[PDB]
């Protein structure tokens, strides 16, 4: 069921870091981590949230598709790739927030809240502003929350439409070679203590599906390769990636 390797904790010691890997094996339904108290600790999801927010927004019409423009709003912000226009697809790849705070906003609190119930995502909780709460207000989700999460998007199970579902998944892809497709999302948390990054998907392989989730303290930008760098050196110890 589940399974803890401590071995694992190298991948984080090796660089004086600090945090946790939950890989879980789709035929097998098998977990596997390197800290089962922490794969089970909630933080804040910060820009992994993008997934069940463009799922709810395109749900409901607010993104009508991947190549709707999105224009920028010529307010010019410290990250340079957000100040341009964007789809979906473009907005995902950058992590651009003020598009998503504009989907937020038309969501509306409301809607907001039901759907993230229907998702079963996380605590359920949106307490704080509409447009800016998995970033500085109440909701939490754990990696196994968040693999919990993306098992039924996989599988088209949450309560949206098959086609919202599919669009998000297009919108997730982030690599893709001979070997394997991973889905994924990354995130960074700042605004509350503690800072952490996120990521967060799956490695589709050719007979099996290898869902994951990460995070780990992140006091400086410099250290956001590390998401994906430790996520990568565990599936290649589990044989998992070449
Ligand atoms: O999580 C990603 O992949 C990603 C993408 C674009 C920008 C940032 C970012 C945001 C804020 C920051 O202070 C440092 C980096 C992260």
Known sequence: ????????????????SQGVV??????????????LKRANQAFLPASTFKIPNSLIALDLGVVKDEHQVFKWDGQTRDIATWNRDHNLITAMKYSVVPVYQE????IGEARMSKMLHAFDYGNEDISG???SFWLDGGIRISATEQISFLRKL????LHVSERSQRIVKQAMLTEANGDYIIRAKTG???????????????????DNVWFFAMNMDMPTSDGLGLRQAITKEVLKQEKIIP
């Open 188 to 206: 960074y948390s700042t605004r509350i203590e503690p800072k952490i990054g996120w990521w967060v998907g799956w490695v589709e392989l050719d």
């Open 22 to 35: 939950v890989l879980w094996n789709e035929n097998k339904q098998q977990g596997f981590t390197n800290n």
């Open 1 to 16: 069921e589940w399974q803890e390797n401590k071995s694992w904790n190298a991948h984080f010691t090796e660089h004086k």
């Open 103 to 106: 989907f937020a906003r038309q």
């Open 154 to 157: 996989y599988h088209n199970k």
């Open 129 to 131: 502003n509409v447009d």
